[PDB]
Design a protein around this nucleic acid. Structure first.
Ligand SMILES: [Mg+2]
Ligand SMILES: [Mg+2]
Ligand SMILES: [Mg+2]
Ligand SMILES: [Mg+2]
Ligand SMILES: [Mg+2]
Ligand SMILES: [Mg+2]
Ligand SMILES: [Mg+2]
Ligand SMILES: [Mg+2]
Ligand SMILES: [Mg+2]
Ligand SMILES: [Mg+2]
Ligand SMILES: [Mg+2]
Ligand SMILES: [Mg+2]
Ligand SMILES: [Mg+2]
Ligand SMILES: [Mg+2]
Ligand SMILES: [Mg+2]
Ligand SMILES: [Mg+2]
Ligand SMILES: [Mg+2]
Ligand SMILES: [Mg+2]
Ligand SMILES: [Mg+2]
Ligand SMILES: [Mg+2]
Ligand SMILES: [Mg+2]
Ligand SMILES: [Mg+2]
Ligand SMILES: [Mg+2]
Ligand SMILES: [Mg+2]
Ligand SMILES: [Mg+2]
Ligand SMILES: [Mg+2]
Ligand SMILES: [Mg+2]
Ligand SMILES: [Mg+2]
Ligand SMILES: [Mg+2]
Ligand SMILES: [Mg+2]
Ligand SMILES: [Mg+2]
Ligand SMILES: [Mg+2]
Ligand SMILES: [Mg+2]
Ligand SMILES: [Mg+2]
Ligand SMILES: [Mg+2]
Ligand SMILES: [Mg+2]
Ligand SMILES: [Mg+2]
Ligand SMILES: [Mg+2]
Ligand SMILES: [Mg+2]
Ligand SMILES: [Mg+2]
Ligand SMILES: [Mg+2]
Ligand SMILES: [Mg+2]
Lengths: 142, 258
RNA sequence: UAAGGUAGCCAAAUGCCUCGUCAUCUAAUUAGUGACGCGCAUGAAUGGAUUAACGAGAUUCCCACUGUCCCUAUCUACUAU
RNA sequence: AGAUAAGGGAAGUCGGCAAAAUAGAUCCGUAACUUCGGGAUAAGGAUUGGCUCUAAGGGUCGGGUACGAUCAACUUAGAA
RNA sequence: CGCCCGUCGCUAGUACCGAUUGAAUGGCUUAGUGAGGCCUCAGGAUCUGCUUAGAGAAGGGGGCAACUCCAUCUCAGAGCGGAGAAUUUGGACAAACUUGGUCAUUUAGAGGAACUAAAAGUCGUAACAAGGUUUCCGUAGGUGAACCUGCGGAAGGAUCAUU
RNA sequence: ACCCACUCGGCACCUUACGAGAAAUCAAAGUCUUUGGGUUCUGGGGGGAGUAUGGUCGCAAGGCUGAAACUUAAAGGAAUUG
RNA sequence: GGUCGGAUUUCCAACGGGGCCUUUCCUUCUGGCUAACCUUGAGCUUGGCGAACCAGGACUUUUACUUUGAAAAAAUUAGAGUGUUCAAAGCAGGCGUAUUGCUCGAAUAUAUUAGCAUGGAAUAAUAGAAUAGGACG
RNA sequence: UAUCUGGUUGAUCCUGCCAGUAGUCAUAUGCUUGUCUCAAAGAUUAAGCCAUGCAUGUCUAAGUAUAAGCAAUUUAUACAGUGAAACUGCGAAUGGCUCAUUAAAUCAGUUAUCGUUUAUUUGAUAGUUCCUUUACUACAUGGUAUAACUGUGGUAAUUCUAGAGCUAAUACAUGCUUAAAAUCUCGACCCUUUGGAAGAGAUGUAUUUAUUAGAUAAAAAAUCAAUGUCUUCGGACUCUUUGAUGAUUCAUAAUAACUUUUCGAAUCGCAUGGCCUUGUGCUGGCGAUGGUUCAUUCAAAUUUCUGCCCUAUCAACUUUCGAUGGUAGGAUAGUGGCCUACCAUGGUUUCAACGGGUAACGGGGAAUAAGGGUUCGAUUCCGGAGAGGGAGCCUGAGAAACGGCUACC
């Protein structure tokens, strides 16, 4: 999270061309969008320099479908975290419940800085990887 | 599997066709057309099971092939052409005119109409878009494309169609105080005068709907068809006009007239 | 009889009869292995039983390999001459 | 003294004596049993040349009160 | 004169251990070989259009005499191409076979060691009364067999009891 | 140090049964068909059998986990009269 | 009973709802309807405060639970009606001057859990302003 | 329709099982069997093997007919009635059967495609294409085969075919014919600075890339860079175009080109009519078929959340060479380790991972039930998977197809 050009290819937003002939403000053309559903696009996303193709604000993904909420239990991947959604499952014979849980690997943009224990809400997107189908849209802890 | 299905067994057909569970293994699969096969009525089952004008598919074919029946002004000599909501069917022989509307039990009724009423139909616009070369167009519920509409026509509105040409005569907007037809779900067939709609941005905008007897309910925006403002409708309503009598008052009326 | 060989082990490098009897190994085995034990004459620091690893120790079988052999032939050097 | 032999492959012989086969390195895989230390290079397989490239692995100098210059190694891996 | 335990012996049955680097079947799989079609590198049988092209002869029109011009049968020869089968390089997919390995399920086995019955078999009499040594637990050793003995424990004891 | 009265926390004891239980008996074994204070472990007729096998611990003796085949109509508990 | 065993109103009561006040914000900004409007023209007239009608907004502690509703294919199950001659069944049929025709149907309920919207807000959790980098303004 | 009874004892009360009892759209079997209605039926063991015969072909008025086929037209000298065959076009990817595989797999309900393909319908939708585009040219319409058919043959045989001679298309493969206006480029030439021009070319749709627009909660002023429409050149200044979604780099439009270059009708049947400068002159209807794009429909493919039986005598599993993720590229119809290169060390698990078993296709449902529940669900409906076991592939919108091919066993 220290440099943008770490990879061997030139990281850039597609079709966002800053003309070298002109000399204007707005240092580089940075494309950003609002994901909708009342989620705020962060000022670090608008003012940052990261690219993050799979970002729900600057990247070419769209959030649509389910909105879930979990707690972050792992951050050891790159731009990807695993949240744990705990729910109660009802058994009709014994007329009572049991604790169950799933681990959901979600993609996190560099606009957010999350730690283990933070609660986040995520939005469903297109298949990002083999397992990731959600994208972090708002962190709401510290 | 492996491609599209061409059959439709009985017990898999939609129940509002009132196909008997006996008398054959198969059901008349509606061909591809302007409506979904679930919310459609083939001309075979309409002519044979509702009108009793024929007894066999052979007799329905014999009626169709001599170009007697026409629907929406077009002859449509197909046995399984899907006739849907508010499609008009003209039989020049017998000079009969039907409009496919639901009765309040959720099935299609034999609603005989006059010729000036058969000369049009209403369509619920499903999307407004810009075609090629910047031409705007709408898509109605029966897949009709109409170019150069009025710019105030947005989605979920009703347009009145000329039915000889494909032009729009006028249009009804969508807000409170509008007379609607419920086409889909549990309340399929009621008519209930929108009070207000709730948004829920993210899917399935709901609308609250109260009939003439002040019995309110709620419906998704997909199943609502505005047919005018409160009081006068733009079409002829069938018998009952979408009240949804309970079973008690229904058997009271059956004991009244007997 | 002083005590009468216990625990164990065995045709064992220790068993005469004996190529002991049974099973396995082979087409065929006085060999090998596993069992049996009235053991001529096994047996407990005369140390008994077992034992991973080690062994230019003794023995059997299997795979590979080959002139060990079927069945010999040819070549080179140094002899022999 | 040193070798090679078609087909067979220990039928030879007291007895595989002698000879042959195996062999180095890298990678994979490795059983019973065990005193848990071993067995183990178990067993059993694959690869290995030349040429043209690619990648990684260093030293010394350089900064008011991130990097650049320069020099030199044989080690490994991969690819045509 | 009740009940009752175990060894040993006969008969029958069930399962276990077991030398045999046992056997059979099925699955999976290392390594090796690897069909087929597909994609590619070519390949060009053959077929075919066009531009021509020259020789040798027929006919026609024209100085009408040699001669000149345009067409027809003949066969080289040249390109510009187009379609294009067999065959073929490399690649990926990869059946299948062989040899091993591993797992699973049945399945043989000399002998050994149990259990269950059956049967009034043999030897004792261990337990039930203080069962004639009070019983039982744990642990160890021993003896034909039930069992005996040692150490500690228990009352399911034969003692709820000595101000 | 004793005595009297009281109090908290103990090892218990005596009498009764409102109650419980199959009874023996139990101030918990009660407040459980008027069936729910919280929670852990174990059992499903008797043998075969705490056996065989496979793991794991142990120097060993053994410990922990732990079947099936087969077999059987009873075993068993508390009390009663002999 | 004011109709001839059907129904109404002024009524004593119970039952569930909503609103307001008692220290009780039970989010408010831009706009429009200005709405119920101090708006009163003589006894129906010329002029109050935005949700009661919307649109966009800024934010917006999170759940569990429960109510209602949407959805949950038909067939099957339960179940309404109906002379398959009864019945299992089926969704038929029934009524006329039967010469031309008319007409009722083919209901409804259940369909877990999960997911969706909605009212409640007790019960069981959760967070907040304490080296004030707290709120109002 | 919330029910118990016999058996341990000399007798009692218990624990406890055994046996009885009722039912089964649960099968088999024994005995018996008169009638009416209705009706399952080689699932279980062998998803073991198959003799024979059928189960997918198909035409109108409207693609192609010289049948050396049948008729009779008598309106016909091109055909025009019927019509085998064959070409062509669709279909054969549906249905039907079975339950072997399969345990987060399928499947159920619930989402999504702002992440894609879609024959067929249904509704809209190409004046732009003569290429030096003044002879390059048929546009009252252009070319080549070839089947059927005739005839010569092969083999024991097959829904086997060769050679030779014709002939067609909605077969293949070519190819033209319609406005105007506007805007851009170049630009001759006049030449002026305020600078204007004759003329030429391009401008449909489709593909590919790049770029731009696709906007906006509010109100006024200050001057310049040049005046900008017209002036009373004081500057009055307005008009200024912007759709949708919760959300997009969306829809759509516009520039620069790119394409080995898509499409933009050389097709067919009936009716034969109106205008005359009366020529086979010009116009002219009702359809059928086809055709690019969009939408729709029939779908398909992936996909969100939650839910599956028994086992720990399976507690750690995954990652050599894909395991989890990142970047970039290939491939796909598209997302995505789907694959490749580089890089990081990740991912699951006592809330039961992984492994094993299932005499396990899942569900709707079925039996029995006071309630709760237990067991079953191969099987009439839905959804999967399969065509003896694997694998591969052509055609096509749609198949890893099997009543379609290829290979191995
Ligand atoms: Mg159909
Ligand atoms: Mg002895
Ligand atoms: Mg001996
Ligand atoms: Mg030997
Ligand atoms: Mg021996
Ligand atoms: Mg000695
Ligand atoms: Mg030695
Ligand atoms: Mg040899
Ligand atoms: Mg030998
Ligand atoms: Mg020998
Ligand atoms: Mg010999
Ligand atoms: Mg010998
Ligand atoms: Mg040697
Ligand atoms: Mg060894
Ligand atoms: Mg005796
Ligand atoms: Mg005796
Ligand atoms: Mg004793
Ligand atoms: Mg005794
Ligand atoms: Mg005694
Ligand atoms: Mg005793
Ligand atoms: Mg003793
Ligand atoms: Mg006892
Ligand atoms: Mg006390
Ligand atoms: Mg005490
Ligand atoms: Mg039991
Ligand atoms: Mg038991
Ligand atoms: Mg007793
Ligand atoms: Mg919830
Ligand atoms: Mg007894
Ligand atoms: Mg008795
Ligand atoms: Mg019973
Ligand atoms: Mg089966
Ligand atoms: Mg099918
Ligand atoms: Mg169309
Ligand atoms: Mg990618
Ligand atoms: Mg990746
Ligand atoms: Mg199965
Ligand atoms: Mg099916
Ligand atoms: Mg298939
Ligand atoms: Mg078969
Ligand atoms: Mg196949
Ligand atoms: Mg078949």
């Amino acid at each position: 999270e220290l440099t943008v050009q770490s990879e061997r290819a030139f990281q850039k937003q597609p079709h966002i061309f800053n003309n070298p002939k002109v000399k204007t403000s707005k240092r580089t053309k940075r494309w950003y969008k609002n994901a909708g559903l009342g989620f705020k696009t962060p000022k670090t996303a608008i003012e940052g320099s990261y690219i993050d193709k799979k970002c729900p604000f600057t990247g070419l993904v769209s959030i649509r479908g389910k909105i879930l909420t979990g707690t972050v239990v792992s951050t050891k991947m790159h731009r990807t975290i695993v949240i744990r959604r705990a729910y109660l499952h009802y058994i009709p014979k014994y007329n009572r419940y049991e604790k169950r849980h799933k681990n959901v690997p979600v993609h996190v943009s560099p606009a957010f800085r999350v730690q283990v224990g933070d609660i986040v809400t995520v939005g469903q997107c297109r298949p990002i990887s083999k397992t990731v189908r959600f994208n972090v849209v708002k962190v709401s802890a510290a | 599997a492996r491609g599209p299905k061409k059959h439709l067994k009985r017990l898999a057909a939609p129940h509002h066709w009132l196909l008997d569970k006996l008398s054959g293994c198969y059901a008349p699969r509606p061909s591809a057309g302007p409506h979904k096969l679930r919310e459609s009525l083939p001309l075979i089952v309409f002519l044979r099971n509702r009108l009793k004008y024929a007894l066999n598919g052979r007799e329905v074919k014999a009626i169709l092939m001599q170009r007697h029946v026409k629907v929406d002004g077009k002859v449509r000599t197909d046995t399984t052409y899907p006739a849907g909501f508010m499609d008009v069917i003209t039989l020049d022989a017998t000079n009969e005119n039907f409009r496919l509307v639901y009765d309040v039990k959720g099935r299609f009724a034999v609603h005989r109409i006059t010729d000036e009423e058969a000369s049009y139909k209403l369509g619920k616009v499903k999307k407004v878009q810009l075609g090629k070369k910047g031409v705007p167009y709408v898509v109605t519920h029966d897949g009709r494309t109409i170019r150069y509409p009025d710019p105030n026509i947005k989605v979920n509105d009703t347009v009145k169609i000329d039915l000889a040409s494909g032009k729009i005569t006028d249009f009804i907007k969508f807000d409170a105080g509008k007379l609607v037809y419920v086409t889909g779900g549990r309340n399929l067939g009621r008519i209930g005068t929108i009070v207000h709609k709730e948004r829920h941005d993210g899917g399935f905008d709901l609308v609250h709907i109260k009939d003439s007897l002040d019995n309110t309910f709620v419906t998704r925006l997909n199943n609502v068809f505005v047919i005018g403002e409160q009081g006068k409708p733009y079409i002829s309503l069938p018998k009952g006009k979408g009240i949804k009598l309970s079973i008690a008052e229904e058997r009271d009326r059956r004991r009244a007239q007997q």
